[PDB]
């Protein structure tokens, strides 16, 4: 009743509190009370139905609804505390029944708790994913109603969690493409002024539109037109913090926009985009997002291309990108550049003649100019004249070392060195002129970094000019100011050593100059950081052990130098929150193709290490000393280890020093990556064998004792930023602790790490999962079984995407010879496989980002190799072929290659039957283009070759084939042989099962060779030696002499 509702709210709060305090009342009793509460909510629905006929206190009815909502808040606290499968299902179904569309209005007083608990409680997947896909559709309908109800103020608070759950551990919303479009339209209808869901819902929309872009690009075009409206919408408003996500979404369109550049999404869209780019600069008036000049681009390097737009299409190479992973400051400022790049992206390919001079060309515009010389230059195809005109302004800027010069130097030198073409001999000394600015840096450490880093080498790096600097390369260094860490590390010395190693090219005293440089390396502002500004080659960086081992390679000895196995071991770690935002979508994109001296140095180093000043520098120099000790053993230092132990004892407070120590352990692994001290030895990790064994590891014993200190799922994101990387390194250290100790102890340790906590390190934990404490099979088998028993101890945790995916990935670590064990491993493997070939995946309800990995594991499941999948892997493959996903589409593209040398005759025929399908829709979505790719692979597959030819005949409607031209020779390097499609079997024998039988539209675009070939073959076509029927009625179409045919 009306008053009974408030009485129930008070009684529920009091009873829940009293039961929780006493703990005598059973959680089963609490679940029964929750069932009674759901019954009371159903009674509330019945009372509303009764009030429909005759009015009984309608305002008091809403008041009773609010009171029952308070009672439901108490009961929801109880349910979040304790959840039973029938009870959780009852609560969820009551929540679902709460939404009444028939009424046309809802109090929504209890609406706050629902989605918040859904995202917060019962996360482990039996309870959560117990709500099936139909429940997700119902949630979509509820969100659609909320869109009309919100701004229902609490509908926004619920929609926050709704957007959090929209792209889930498995989200089939994009699978519901009509529902996907409807929900996208609903989301676009409320361009929210302020919403925590705005960024996550827009990100889910961006991922879905990215999926829609290659396959069914028509829905992608509808979404893109909506985004075109949203672009001017963003051009209207101004709020920088939300503008971060707004620009993120605009950039999500931006790869698709660059796609649409070739064939205009709108021919006039460029001018509108230019206006919106002016609005983008206006929004970027926030000086926080600023110029890329001195972005400080930590860890930039040459010989590996850049990823600023993060699209492989550019082929632009190695721009020194702001690290943005420092703990990632510049990315949002880099966001400003994208806005600039956006206007730079804007042809209004059309601005160059005017964009040459008019622009103020500020540093904020200068970074955009660098982006121009990369990408707009890629899209430019500028002739010699345009480059001749453009280079003049940058050259003049370089002439005067004014404020215009410094921000220019990097981009200008990059444009000079890297371009569409090369240059003439006239600019020869001009490189030294370029070198002058770098010479300027060689003493001026501040502006130095790029100059001393890039284009200080390129003349050496590209042997495209006269060796005039053969005397002049050391000339700037001749200032006795060569020793400079001001730039990207080790570049100058290493490149110079290589260059002078040409042919008597080092026949000069410059080896002594290198010796002086190394001596400076020994004491370069000894025991402390020299400078405070921008920290290049900093102690702040992890290490460059290659420099430590370098000197011998720098030394010229007869065939003695050089090594292998650099082993970065996740050094860049570009992953970052606020960088991980676009990264997981940016992880995958598969658009359809279109358009004794060293002994002396070490001896002095001992005395140098006898004194130290700084602590972070202590870590850096400890790494240097340990690497030299590995380097010395290569030439052949427990004292450096003792010094590092002292430095560690100094950092007694935090564990991030132990994180630096884990970096040093990764350094040992990189020394271990080197075969041994002598090198080129069959022994692996022998170079770090002393580091690992207690001998020469007395200080490492102390570090291991430090490691012995006790101190949704943690693998939250498939595309995971750092910290999850920190979790991976932490698990590595966990392994390292027991490794130094010399499992049941490892079992108790992984028990100390919570299942949710230990869920983070997929590859890291999987490595130990493959590892066995002893060679005895039973112990490792029992440990793996205990791991499965812990994952399924809460069957929901096993049901969770994180734990099951961890098991799936660890299976690949278990994918090996495994000769010793032959007992029950397959049984537990199948017990896992029941939901490893996920029951969701079996129902095609698996993860989208997880879908490609699932196919990769299914291929990694190799029935043909040794042991077949007892359950038909062919059946799963056929279901997946019926199944549809863009990641699964690229997986299907790869599966044709995977089929080769892996098709057992029965399995081959089973796949061939699925390989046979005449599909119309997937061609525009390129799914049937993937089928045509499989058909070309079948042309590469002699097995069922006649079937391959039949599938060639039936596979192509020729829709998009003419423009494709064997994917412009990508599918077939020489199409013309099969462009005139008369295959060996096809040309020699008329294609047949053994009204025109040949489909002209599937055959070719024009009459071309098709009609004449058919006319020529008509004689064999009529009598096709499989039946006498083909002769009949052939003469009616032939309109030729019958007597001649009979002859």
Numbering used by the authors: 15 to 165, 200 to 373, 377 to 399, 417 to 663, 682 to 722, 756 to 830, 855 to 885, 891 to 1142, ...
Excerpt from the publication:
The ataxia–telangiectasia mutated (ATM), an apical kinase that orchestrates the multifaceted DNA damage response, is the master regulator of genome stability, and is a critical therapeutic target in cancer. ATM/Tel1 kinase functions as an obligate homodimer with a highly dynamic N-terminal helical solenoid domain responsible for ligand binding and a conserved C-terminal FAT/kinase/FATC domain6. However, the activation mechanism of ATM/Tel1 in response to DNA damage remains largely unknown.
Previous cryo-EM structure of the ATM/Tel1 from Schizosaccharomyces pombe in the basal state has illustrated a dimer interface and the consecutive helical solenoids inhibiting the kinase activation. We show that ATM/Tel1 in the basal state adopts a symmetric dimer configuration with the kinase N-lobe suspended, keeping the N- and C-lobes misaligned, and the PRD fully ordered, blocking the substrate access to the active site. In its basal state, the PRD features fully ordered kα9b, kα9c, and the linker loop, which collectively create a complete obstruction to substrate access to the active site. This structural arrangement likely accounts for the significantly lower affinity of the CHK2 peptide to the basal-state ATM/Tel1. Upon activation, the Spiral shifts upward towards the FAT-Pincer, and the FAT harbors a coordinated conformational change, with the height reduced from 200 Å in the basal state to 164 Å. Two of the conformations, Structure 1 and Structure 3, which are closer to the basal and active states, respectively, do not bind to the substrate peptide. These structures were resolved at nominal global resolutions of 3.6 Å and 4.0 Å, respectively.
